[PDB]
Amino acid sequence: TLINQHILKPAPPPTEIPARLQVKPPQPAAMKIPNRPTLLGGSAI
Amino acid sequence: SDYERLMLLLSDRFMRLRFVEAWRKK
Questions:
Q1: Inter-CA distances, B17 with A3, A7, A20, B22, Å
Q2: In chain B, which residues have their Cβ closer than 8 Å to the Cβ of A21?
Q3: What is the DSSP code string of A3-29?
């Protein structure tokens, strides 16, 4: 058995839209291998 | 050549060998 936590309350944190772009075709393309951990949400044009 | 200038939008287009040839010497 295990005793579990609970969700608190509707708390709203919105994200924001950053500005840069990238081209680089290698797998790391940043600091490490996976990409959806290291890609900025939704970027501005 | 403004077709190529349109077809290249958002393209934006040996130092790490230097810092490893010293450590391969050591």
A1: 53, 50, 27, 9
A2: 10, 12
A3: ----------------B------SS-S
Approach to solving: cryo-EM
Residue B17's Cα: distance from chain center in Å?
A: 14
Contact status of B1 with chain A (Cβ, < 8 Å): no
Q: Which amino acid is at B4?
A: E
Type of residue found at B13: R
Show residues of chain B in contact with A23, CB under 8 Å.
11-13
Distance (Å) of CA B6 to CA A20, A22, B3, B9: 20, 18, 5, 6
